[PDB]
């Protein structure tokens, strides 16, 4: 780990050493060839691990420095487990290790199906938590990045022109303005259609999940949350999809005045999407709007992801919250992130129905190590 | 090259950025020199919160007294590689100048201080002349009035002429009547200490989307201005006032080819010319927020702000303006700093004034075309304070070495020597003229 934690893999600086190496720790520690696989994005490592079992799971992970989070450890602490099952021929589970807004990568996945099937699969880790209390996300939120570009012109008028002209800040302005209402909740025409309820599972985690209100304020730095309650806090930052505005820029913004109409206008958008609803068809109902709302320029976008919600009751999750308990002495499990991740490529292009992203101080690698552990023996079994 | 070229090169030749404040100091101290020198009377710097003022007097014991207004302030010259000569190299080719200030407004500054010196130098200045150079026009003239305030019996006048105007596309000399007033604006919200990872958005209020919302409360999506009581000051033209929008000649392919639109909001000339000098704004000059540059960064960004200027006409009054916007920003849930600055009062005057005839008739004699009468610019200029703080109802702003040629406010200003020649020659003769009408 310490070996693995020294060498740099950044800007594309100093990667293949990391790759080449990671190639070369795979086989030591668990006797099987490693593959290396380029692609029109970065290398992908590859490597897998039969043990004529029932069962097939996938691991996934992505590969200041002097070592004295990012897969900084995760990846080592869950491989050196699979090695110490290897050597006692306790391992009852195939294994298949594929190691890394995502534009690309879900390339790579679609021309490798058939390699990369499994029953499960595991995402990059989950951490400590604040709490210490191991963390278990059964998900993620899907997304959808969008630009926005009104350009009117070839240059900056001088203001006293406004009367003649139309001005792309109050226009661009107005465009994002149709798109929420005051308390946020998005104006787009049929966005929340595919929508789906929770499940009775669902509401139970989203209820058990403790944040400490008065924490997370102070560590967000905000003067006011648009609500107080934990029950209510849990509940919109897991459960609500959004429209968020993460960027406006037009004219000029410097100190002092320079009076002027711009010519150009743009604005950074970015949806966070729940289950069932899909970014392309988001995006779809996002132009159909535009244009009823007179919209006049250029629509970008990227980083389409899908949400994803995988069953507490299924087998593999089942596995990750009776094996944390062993090694950690309750685990904090939540049904998605308010975040994202490429988890819905692999639930939706590989068919693995069940996902999970779960299991820095010396301490918790080796806790990872043992979770790790505990859980690739309880699977099989379960 | 004679006293009076010479003179304007090295005039040029001096950095003056009012912006930065880069050379003012020089600038006023070289122009203060200069005005002793040529007129041989007695100039002074006199002090101001901000940038100086050259005052000066020459008196003939006339019965008429005319208070001269310039600037020697210039705008600021970014970015400098657009630039073919150096900003301030003041450049001879083609006959013509290369310098920042060239038009706006140095060249028609110096070719007024010499046709005062040439009328003097022949005894032939019939009218009594104040001189009033500031250096803060560019940014808005802060710190005039409150020097006016304090020297109203010093700067008493019969009449006024203001920093002056230049060719119009045709090359006729224009006289202008007029200013509309201004009110810049700046809008602030500040929701945190930081920006957040927009996986919160749920949790908290973004400012961009507010203040995009509050902007939008302000105007229709024609530009009509929505705040309660705006218009309600603004009185209806005089039947003189719309014959000269009438007159008023606007090459419209010409014209929307030089702003650079794809599309403008009106086709015919006297709509453009109606809505260019008659309608008052509500202007968004800036608007940032979160993140801007290549790629995706995903936040709740915790700061947004947006600039506003307000142009104004009769009988708004920018003060009160400030007023109603910000009843408004209250009723539209606004919760954040507004700061504001650069009141500026609009401003008409007579076309029957002696002054304002006096201007017309010179302009005719010596450029031998027909003078383009507008009742008031587009643009803003501190007329009101000489009209309504000194009381000098006589005003107009007419002379002016540039023109529609000349760039100013951007890279390249110059110049036709010619034309600076000429700008002499018209000053000359108006001064000749103004005090026998
Ligand atoms: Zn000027």
Redesign the interface.
């Known amino acids: 780990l310490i070996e693995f934690l020294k060498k740099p893999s950044i800007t594309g600086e100093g990667i293949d050493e990391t790759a080449n190496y990671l190639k070369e720790t795979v086989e030591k520690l668990l006797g099987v060839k490693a593959n290396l696989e380029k692609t029109k994005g970065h290398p992908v490592v590859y490597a897998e691990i039969n043990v004529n079992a029932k069962k097939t799971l996938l691991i996934y992970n992505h590969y200041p420095f002097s070592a004295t989070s990012d897969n900084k450890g995760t990846l080592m602490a869950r491989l050196f487990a699979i090695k110490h099952l290897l050597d006692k021929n306790e391992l009852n589970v195939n294994v298949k290790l594929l190691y890394e807004?995502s534009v690309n990568l879900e390339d790579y996945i679609e021309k490798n199906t058939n390699k990369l099937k499994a029953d499960s699969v595991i995402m990059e880790g989950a951490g400590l938590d604040p709490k210490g209390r191991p963390q278990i996300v059964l998900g993620v939120?899907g997304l959808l990045?969008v630009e926005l570009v009104l350009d009117?012109?070839?240059?900056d008028?001088?203001?006293?022109?406004?009367?003649?002209?139309?001005?792309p800040?109050?226009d661009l302005?107005?465009i994002?303005?149709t798109?929420?209402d005051?308390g946020?909740r998005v104006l787009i025409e049929g966005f929340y259609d595919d929508v789906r309820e929770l499940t009775e599972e669902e509401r139970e985690l989203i209820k058990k999940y403790d944040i400490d209100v008065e924490e997370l304020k102070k560590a967000?730095?905000?003067?006011?949350?648009?609500?107080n309650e934990k029950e209510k806090?849990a509940e919109?930052?897991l459960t609500?999809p959004?429209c968020?505005?993460?960027?406006?820029?037009?004219?000029?913004?410097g100190k002092?005045?320079?009076?002027?109409?711009?010519?150009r206008?743009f604005?950074?958008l970015?949806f966070?999407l729940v289950p069932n609803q899909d970014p392309y068809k988001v995006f779809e109902l996002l132009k159909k709007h535009l244009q009823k709302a007179?919209f006049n320029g250029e629509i970008l976008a990227?980083?389409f992801e899908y949400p994803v919600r995988t069953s507490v009751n299924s087998t593999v999750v089942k596995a990750m919250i009776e094996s944390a308990k062993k090694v950690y002495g309750e685990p904090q499990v939540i049904p998605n992130?308010?975040?994202?991740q490429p988890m819905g490529l692999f639930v939706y292009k590989l068919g693995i129905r069940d996902a999970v992203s779960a299991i820095i101080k010396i301490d918790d690698y080796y806790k990872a190590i043992k979770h790790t552990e505990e859980f690739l023996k309880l699977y099989p079994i379960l």
């Not at 009117?152 to 240059?155: L, M």
């Not at 967000?220 to 609500?227: A, Q, S």
């Not at 968020?244 to 913004?253: L, M, P």
């Open positions: 807004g939120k990045y009117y012109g070839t240059k008028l001088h203001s006293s022109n406004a009367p003649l002209v139309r001005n800040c109050i302005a107005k994002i303005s798109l929420v005051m946020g967000l730095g905000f003067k006011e949350l648009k609500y806090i919109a930052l609500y959004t968020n505005v993460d960027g406006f820029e037009c004219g000029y913004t002092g005045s320079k009076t002027i109409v711009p010519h206008a604005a950074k970015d966070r007179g990227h980083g992130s308010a975040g994202t």
